[PDB]
Scaffold this active site. Structure first.
Site, mmCIF file in Angstrom:
data_model
loop_
_atom_site.group_PDB
_atom_site.id
_atom_site.type_symbol
_atom_site.label_atom_id
_atom_site.label_comp_id
_atom_site.label_asym_id
_atom_site.label_seq_id
_atom_site.Cartn_x
_atom_site.Cartn_y
_atom_site.Cartn_z
ATOM 1 N N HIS A 88 -10.379 4.380 4.129
ATOM 2 C CA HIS A 88 -9.534 3.716 5.108
ATOM 3 C C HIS A 88 -9.720 2.216 5.086
ATOM 4 O O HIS A 88 -9.886 1.512 6.083
ATOM 5 C CB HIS A 88 -9.805 4.275 6.515
ATOM 6 C CG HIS A 88 -8.655 5.117 6.987
ATOM 7 N ND1 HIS A 88 -8.741 6.486 7.114
ATOM 8 C CD2 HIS A 88 -7.402 4.782 7.357
ATOM 9 C CE1 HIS A 88 -7.585 6.964 7.536
ATOM 10 N NE2 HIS A 88 -6.759 5.946 7.698
ATOM 11 N N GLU B 141 0.818 -1.203 0.000
ATOM 12 C CA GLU B 141 0.000 0.000 0.000
ATOM 13 C C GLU B 141 0.857 1.261 0.000
ATOM 14 O O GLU B 141 2.047 1.213 0.329
ATOM 15 C CB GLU B 141 -0.897 -0.027 1.251
ATOM 16 C CG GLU B 141 -0.071 0.099 2.530
ATOM 17 C CD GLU B 141 -0.924 0.511 3.712
ATOM 18 O OE1 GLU B 141 -1.479 1.628 3.719
ATOM 19 O OE2 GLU B 141 -1.051 -0.317 4.627
#
Length: 109
Positions: A101, A72
C-alpha cells in the site's frame, strides 16, 4: 484471459503505452456504484480493476524526471475489497511495484 498481473500489465504498458481494457479510474468506478467500504467493485463493474489515476508522489518515494507524471493501477484484483498491490508507471514508461500500500516501491522495468 484478464491482464492484471505485474508482468502482464508491465509488458502491456511499455508496449501499448496505456492500460489494458479492464482498467477504469476511481471516478468511473464510483459513478458505476463502487463503494469502497462495501468492497463491491466486482459486483458493480465485473472484470474491472481500478487503474489510470495520477499518483502524487509528494513524498519523493519514486524518482521523477523534471516534467514526469506518475500513474497507478491495481494489480492482482479480482473481487471484494481492493488489495495492497499496485503498479506505478511514469510518463516515459518506468515501471515500479508496491505490495504494501504505497509504503515502499521496487523497480520492475
Amino acid at each position: 484471459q484478464v491482464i492484471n498481473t505485474f508482468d502482464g500489465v508491465a509488458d502491456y504498458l511499455q508496449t501499448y503505452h496505456k492500460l489494458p481494457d479492464n482498467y477504469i479510474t476511481k471516478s468511473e468506478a464510483q459513478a458505476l456504484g463502487w463503494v469502497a467500504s462495501k468492497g463491491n467493485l466486482a459486483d458493480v463493474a465485473p472484470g474491472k480493476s481500478i487503474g489510470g489515476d495520477i499518483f502524487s508522489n509528494r513524498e519523493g518515494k519514486l524518482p521523477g524526471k523534471s516534467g514526469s507524471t506518475w500513474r497507478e493501477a491495481d494489480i492482482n484484483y479480482t473481487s471484494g475489497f481492493r488489495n495492497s498491490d499496485r503498479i506505478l508507471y511514469s510518463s516515459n514508461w518506468l515501471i515500479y511495484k508496491t505490495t504494501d500500500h504505497y509504503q515502499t516501491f521496487t523497480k520492475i522495468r
